[PDB]
Amino acid sequence: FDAIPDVIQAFKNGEFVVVLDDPSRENEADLIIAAESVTTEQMAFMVRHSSGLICAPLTPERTTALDLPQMVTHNADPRGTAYTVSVDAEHPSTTTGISAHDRALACRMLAAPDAQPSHFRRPGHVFPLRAVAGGVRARRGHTEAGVELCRLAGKRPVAVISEIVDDGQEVEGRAVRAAPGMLRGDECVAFARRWGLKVCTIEDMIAHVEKTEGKL
Amino acid sequence: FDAIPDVIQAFKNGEFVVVLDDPSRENEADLIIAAESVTTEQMAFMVRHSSGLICAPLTPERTTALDLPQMVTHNADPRGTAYTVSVDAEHPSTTTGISAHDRALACRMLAAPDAQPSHFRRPGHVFPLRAVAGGVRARRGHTEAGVELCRLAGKRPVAVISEIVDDGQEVEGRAVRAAPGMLRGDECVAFARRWGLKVCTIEDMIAHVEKTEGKL
Ligand SMILES: [Mn+2]
Ligand SMILES: [Mn+2]
């Protein structure tokens, strides 16, 4: 695993970083990137290698500023992922909201300093997620990890995350993939190396933050 | 394009079919399959080749039976896609809700004859979509097309749909894909042929339905 300072620097440079949560939690790795300058081509890569459910972690302050209420008032999961209502970018270049171009645009607009509620059509195809106020020390999820990286790298308080799946194997001429799953542990590290990305754990990220804040 | 009767038969056989809406509308092709027996391996293929936003078109009767209210009360789009609150399957085999296994399971459970509201955790990772009562003749969307195919093929009234994207080209060692987009027209047909699938247009589907119902 890479050291957190090095992950921060890559994140500051607008790169995706690969982040694993605890094996006792989801045991999943997500691609996490700063939303402010995510490119169409980067989004296409993200869609290709992830679940395709492209989320945008942001702070409670941003959910209030942008008027993004929680999708559900009484969450099935109490520590559950805090989905807000979904969005598309209100921009002349948006078409259906699903393309790599459109999803990247929605993410950059969510992160813009002058963002306003009217900049987003609801519902849509990008899924903002409300990080808890206490950050990664309080909730050890990828949502918090993305917002934490934005803070640590001096970026706008909106990230983009999606889970790295195991697409299994192609089966020539057949609309199936054999032995699919989720990418785990070492495979996640191998994926990062293949793509020139830094890779880390939320546990190490928490250890990093604790150097300044102490244990929660 | 294949003739609608032949698309119906493939759909009845549990295959994906490729369906294009009008060029003046989204100009997009979706993979559409019956939800009732979608397999883990099929879902993995769907995720790999689509946007990854896996939706489940269903009737108004099913949204009431399963207690799936619209995600938003005052839709940004008036003829907009009718997203309900998202779901995961309440089943012992579900883990995080995002894997091909978990999403396929949620779809099969939405389609089960004995489905009940409590079978679904909200929010989640599968996106049910409420088809309009008037079917494809009333709203020429993929949501309606999926429900229409279920009716035509004698299946449970729940389909699975997702847009076929153009993932662009891989760039060795770099986390980007060049020239991504949406797959269109002839390319959609080529995609269907490559994968042994039937391919059609919503316009021809409407023409099929009109043979029995007349023009709306
Ligand atoms: Mn996660
Ligand atoms: Mn569509």
From Swiss-Prot, chains A, B:
Disulfide pattern: none
MF terms (GO), sorted A to Z: 3,4-dihydroxy-2-butanone-4-phosphate synthase activity; metal ion binding
Binding, D-ribulose 5-phosphate: 30, 81, 139-143
Pfam families: DHBP_synthase
Site residues by UniProt (Essential for catalytic activity): 125, 163
GO terms for cellular component: cytosol; mitochondrial intermembrane space
Residues involved in Mg(2+) 1 binding: 26
UniProt: Mn(2+) 1 binding residues: 26
Protein name: 3,4-dihydroxy-2-butanone 4-phosphate synthase
The species this protein was found in: Pyricularia oryzae (strain 70-15 / ATCC MYA-4617 / FGSC 8958) (Rice blast fungus)
Gene that encodes it: RIB3
